[PDB]
Enzyme design. Structure first.
Site, short mmCIF file in Angstrom:
data_model
loop_
_atom_site.label_atom_id
_atom_site.label_comp_id
_atom_site.label_asym_id
_atom_site.label_seq_id
_atom_site.Cartn_x
_atom_site.Cartn_y
_atom_site.Cartn_z
N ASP A 1 0.78 -1.25 0.00
CA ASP A 1 0.00 0.00 0.00
C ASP A 1 0.80 1.30 0.00
O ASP A 1 0.29 2.34 0.39
CB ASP A 1 -0.94 0.00 1.24
CG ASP A 1 -0.16 -0.20 2.60
OD1 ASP A 1 1.05 -0.59 2.61
OD2 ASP A 1 -0.78 0.02 3.67
N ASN B 1 4.58 3.51 4.70
CA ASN B 1 3.92 3.21 5.97
C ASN B 1 2.79 2.20 5.80
O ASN B 1 2.80 1.42 4.83
CB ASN B 1 3.44 4.49 6.65
CG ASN B 1 4.56 5.49 6.85
OD1 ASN B 1 5.49 5.27 7.62
ND2 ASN B 1 4.48 6.61 6.14
N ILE C 1 0.85 -1.04 5.73
CA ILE C 1 1.38 -2.39 5.80
C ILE C 1 2.85 -2.38 5.37
O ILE C 1 3.22 -1.72 4.38
CB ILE C 1 0.48 -3.50 5.15
CG1 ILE C 1 1.24 -4.28 4.10
CG2 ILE C 1 -0.84 -2.99 4.75
CD1 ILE C 1 1.82 -5.50 4.66
N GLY D 1 5.48 -24.13 -2.25
CA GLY D 1 5.42 -22.92 -3.06
C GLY D 1 5.49 -21.61 -2.29
O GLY D 1 6.50 -21.34 -1.61
N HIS E 1 7.51 -11.23 1.98
CA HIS E 1 7.65 -10.04 1.13
C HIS E 1 7.67 -8.78 1.95
O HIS E 1 6.89 -8.64 2.89
CB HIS E 1 6.52 -9.94 0.06
CG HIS E 1 6.35 -11.18 -0.77
ND1 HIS E 1 5.10 -11.61 -1.18
CD2 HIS E 1 7.27 -12.12 -1.10
CE1 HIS E 1 5.29 -12.78 -1.73
NE2 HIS E 1 6.57 -13.14 -1.71
N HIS F 1 9.88 -10.62 12.73
CA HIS F 1 8.43 -10.78 12.88
C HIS F 1 7.83 -11.67 11.78
O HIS F 1 7.05 -12.60 12.05
CB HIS F 1 7.76 -9.38 12.91
CG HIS F 1 6.27 -9.43 12.96
ND1 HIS F 1 5.53 -9.41 14.12
CD2 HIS F 1 5.37 -9.59 11.96
CE1 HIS F 1 4.24 -9.57 13.80
NE2 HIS F 1 4.09 -9.67 12.49
N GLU F 2 8.16 -11.34 10.53
CA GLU F 2 7.69 -12.09 9.36
C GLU F 2 8.10 -13.56 9.41
O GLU F 2 7.27 -14.46 9.14
CB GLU F 2 8.23 -11.43 8.08
CG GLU F 2 7.69 -10.02 7.78
CD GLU F 2 6.20 -9.89 8.04
OE1 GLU F 2 5.44 -10.85 7.75
OE2 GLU F 2 5.81 -8.83 8.59
N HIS G 1 5.88 -15.87 11.27
CA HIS G 1 4.73 -16.31 10.46
C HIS G 1 5.19 -17.41 9.51
O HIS G 1 4.47 -18.39 9.33
CB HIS G 1 4.16 -15.16 9.61
CG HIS G 1 3.37 -14.15 10.39
ND1 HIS G 1 2.27 -14.45 11.16
CD2 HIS G 1 3.58 -12.82 10.57
CE1 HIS G 1 1.86 -13.34 11.76
NE2 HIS G 1 2.63 -12.32 11.44
N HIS H 1 -0.28 -13.94 15.41
CA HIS H 1 -0.03 -12.74 16.20
C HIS H 1 -0.32 -12.98 17.67
O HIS H 1 -1.22 -13.74 18.02
CB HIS H 1 -0.89 -11.58 15.70
CG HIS H 1 -0.36 -10.96 14.44
ND1 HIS H 1 -1.16 -10.38 13.48
CD2 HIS H 1 0.91 -10.86 13.98
CE1 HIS H 1 -0.37 -9.97 12.49
NE2 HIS H 1 0.89 -10.24 12.75
C1 LIG Z 1 -0.79 -7.51 6.30
C2 LIG Z 1 -0.88 -8.10 7.69
C3 LIG Z 1 -0.43 -9.55 7.66
C4 LIG Z 1 -0.06 -7.26 8.69
C5 LIG Z 1 1.47 -7.22 8.57
C6 LIG Z 1 2.14 -8.38 9.35
O1 LIG Z 1 1.78 -8.73 10.49
N1 LIG Z 1 3.28 -8.79 8.84
O2 LIG Z 1 3.41 -10.08 9.35
C7 LIG Z 1 1.99 -5.80 8.84
O3 LIG Z 1 2.46 -5.12 7.92
N2 LIG Z 1 1.94 -5.37 10.09
C8 LIG Z 1 2.44 -4.05 10.44
C9 LIG Z 1 1.47 -3.34 11.39
C10 LIG Z 1 1.76 -1.86 11.53
O4 LIG Z 1 1.43 -1.10 10.60
O5 LIG Z 1 2.32 -1.47 12.57
C11 LIG Z 1 3.83 -4.18 11.07
O6 LIG Z 1 4.35 -3.22 11.66
N3 LIG Z 1 4.42 -5.37 10.96
C12 LIG Z 1 5.75 -5.68 11.49
C13 LIG Z 1 6.11 -5.79 12.94
C14 LIG Z 1 5.13 -6.04 13.91
C15 LIG Z 1 5.46 -6.18 15.27
C16 LIG Z 1 6.80 -6.07 15.66
C17 LIG Z 1 7.79 -5.81 14.70
C18 LIG Z 1 7.45 -5.67 13.36
CA LIG Z 2 8.04 -21.38 -0.11
CA LIG Z 3 3.41 0.10 3.17
ZN LIG Z 4 3.21 -10.58 -1.25
ZN LIG Z 5 2.42 -10.15 11.54
#
Ligand SMILES: CC(C)C[C@H](C(=O)NO)C(=O)N[C@@H](CC(=O)O)C(=O)NCc1ccccc1
Ligand SMILES: [Ca+2]
Ligand SMILES: [Ca+2]
Ligand SMILES: [Zn+2]
Ligand SMILES: [Zn+2]
Length: 158
Positions: A70, A73, A75, A85, A91, A113-114, A117, A123
């Site tokens: 998006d 900042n 996502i 796969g 990403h 964090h990723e 998952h 979460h």
């Molecule tokens: C699209 C969904 C799956 C949300 C996504 C996520 O959880 N990544 O796994 C995400 O981009 N979360 C943001 C939420 C935000 O805007 O603050 C984030 O900061 N993710 C990374 C993160 C979260 C907790 C600790 C460290 C890093």
């Molecule tokens: Ca894979």
């Molecule tokens: Ca973004």
């Molecule tokens: Zn993707």
């Molecule tokens: Zn997450």
């Protein structure tokens, strides 16, 4: 509950972000995997080309997986649960400012964090856990996995 049925997993950094040098990007990713490695039986091996279990890439807006980024900042990144796969892949939004510092947003913390998952965790509602939904900076030198996350991976594997 999806989980990997193998312990030595491979990963591949398909592309980079210009923000950091390639060594810095690779180090952030290396240390992010080490975190989970020290609290579980998983061993991660980097391949430079080929089909790795977990692909790591920096993409913009639409990128062929039906969950577009998006812009700046909002996502920051997303990962897929263990499986074939796309499964396990991660990403990062190329439109972000990726850093090595306290400035938004620290690639190591987001990566860590990723990968949770990618390994099968969901979460956490504990604000001190790495698997907490929103981003927060914490010191990264000598960083160690919060106790809620250790509980999390141990509950999956061991
Ligand atoms: C699209 C969904 C799956 C949300 C996504 C996520 O959880 N990544 O796994 C995400 O981009 N979360 C943001 C939420 C935000 O805007 O603050 C984030 O900061 N993710 C990374 C993160 C979260 C907790 C600790 C460290 C890093
Ligand atoms: Ca894979
Ligand atoms: Ca973004
Ligand atoms: Zn993707
Ligand atoms: Zn997450």
């Amino acid at each position: 509950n999806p989980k990997w049925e193998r312990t030595n997993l491979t990963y591949r950094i398909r592309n980079y972000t210009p923000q950091l040098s390639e060594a810095e990007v690779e180090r952030a990713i290396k240390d992010a995997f080490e975190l989970w490695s020290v609290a579980s039986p998983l061993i991660f091996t980097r391949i430079s080309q080929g089909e790795a279990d977990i692909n790591i890439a920096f993409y913009q807006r639409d990128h062929g997986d039906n969950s577009p980024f998006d812009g700046p900042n909002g996502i920051l990144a997303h990962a897929f649960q263990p499986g074939q796969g796309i499964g396990g892949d991660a990403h990062f939004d190329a439109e972000e400012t990726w850093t090595n510092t306290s400035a938004n947003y620290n690639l190591f913390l987001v990566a860590a964090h990723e990968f949770g998952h990618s390994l099968g965790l969901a979460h956490s509602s504990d604000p001190g856990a790495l698997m907490y939904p929103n981003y927060a900076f914490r010191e990264t030198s000598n960083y160690s996995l919060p106790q809620d996350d250790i509980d999390g991976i141990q509950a999956i594997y061991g």
